[PDB]
């Protein structure tokens, strides 16, 4: 849904792209132990087990607790 148009001199391309709204008809009304724990978490979040095991103090201390923040 974009309108392309060179200008008369042909030196600049003009693109008209209005934002199209979602039609009302295209919408639905609003409705009104360590082992087993890690298996449950992996099933819940569609991950593997390895993510949920802890890490040693060395890794934990290596993690930066005051990371730079942008925007």
């Amino acid at each position: 849904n974009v309108e392309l148009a060179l200008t008369s001199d042909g030196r600049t391309i003009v693109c008209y792209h209005p934002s199209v709204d979602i039609p009302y008809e295209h919408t639905k009304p609003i409705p009104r132990e360590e082992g087993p724990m890690i298996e449950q978490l992996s099933k819940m979040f569609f991950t593997t087990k390895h993510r949920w095991y802890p890490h040693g103090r060395y890794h934990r201390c290596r993690k930066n607790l005051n990371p730079p923040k942008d925007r």
Binding site: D21, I22, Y24, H26, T27, K28, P29, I30, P31, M44, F45, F46, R71
Partner: protein, 94 residues
């Protein structure tokens, strides 16, 4: 206030109620909250887009993890659009 968000600066409670009040001031009926898009509804990481419709016309839609959160965020987006404090509004002139 550059880079700040409207409701990051102005803390509000019940944005849906506040939006309903504003629409009443504008003599407009209460918007219909309606589920425009959704993803993974039965999982632990759902995505919902809820749009507020004024007479079958979309005024603002917002995303969220639950339908309630998406509706609340859509209310916030509608308030931003009504007040002209949208993210892509004309930047301040200096």
């Amino acid at each position: 206030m550059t880079g700040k968000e409207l409701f990051e600066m102005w803390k509000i409670i019940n944005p849906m109620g506040l939006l309903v009040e504003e629409l009443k001031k504008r003599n407009v009926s209460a918007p219909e909250s309606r589920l425009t898009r959704q993803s993974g509804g039965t999982t632990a990481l759902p995505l919902y887009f809820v749009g507020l419709y004024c007479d079958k016309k979309l005024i603002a839609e917002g995303p969220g993890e639950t339908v309630l959160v998406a509706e609340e965020e859509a209310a916030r987006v509608a308030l931003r659009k009504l007040y002209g404090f949208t993210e892509n509004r004309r930047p301040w002139n200096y």
